[PDB]
C-alpha cells in the first residue's frame, strides 16, 4: 500500500544521498579505488531512485 | 582513524539498507525496481568489502 511504497521510495532517496556523502568522504581520505567504486555506486543508486519515483512517486 | 571508521560504517550501512530495500521491493512485487536494487546491493557489498580491507581493524 501507500505506506510501504513511501517507505521504499524514501529509502531509495537516502541511499542515493548516502552514496554521494560517502564518495565525498572517500575522496577526502584519498581512497581512490574506493571512491571510483562509490562513484559508480551513486550512478546505480540514482537509477534505482528514478525507477522507484516512476512507480511510487504518485 | 575515526574518519576512516566513519567511511567504513557508511559503506556498511549502504550495504545493509540496500539489502532491506531489496526485500521490501520483493514484498511489493515491484520487480523492475527489485532487479535494479539487487544489482545496487551487489555493488554496495563490493564497496563495503573494499573499504573493510583498507580501513578495518
Q: Which residues of A, range 1-58, sit inside 8 Å of B by Cβ?
A: 4-5, 7-8, 11-12, 14-15, 18-19, 21-22, 25-26, 28-29, 31, 33-34, 37-38, 40-41, 44-45, 47-48, 51-52, 55
- Opening angle at CA B28, ends A9 and A22, nearest 5: 35
The residues after which chain B has a C–N gap greater than 2.5 Å are none
Grid coordinates 548516502 are at which residue?
A18
Resolution (A): 1.5
User: What backbone torsions phi and psi does residue A29 show, to the nearest 5 degrees?
Assistant: -85, 0
Residue numbers of the domain that contains B39: 1-57
CATH of the domain at B52: 1.10.287.230
> How many domains is chain A built from?
1
Question: Are the CB atoms for A35 and B7 separated by under 8 Å?
Answer: no
- Determination technique for this PDB entry? X-ray
A:B CB pairs within 8 Å = 87
Closest CA relative to residue B17, chosen from A1, A45, A35: A45
Amino acid at each position: 500500500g501507500t505506506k510501504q511504497e513511501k517507505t521504499a521510495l524514501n529509502m531509495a532517496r537516502f541511499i542515493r544521498s548516502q552514496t554521494l556523502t560517502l564518495l565525498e568522504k572517500l575522496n577526502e581520505l584519498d581512497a581512490d579505488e574506493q571512491a571510483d567504486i562509490c562513484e559508480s555506486l551513486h550512478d546505480h543508486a540514482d537509477e534505482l531512485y528514478r525507477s522507484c519515483l516512476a512507480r511510487f512517486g504518485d
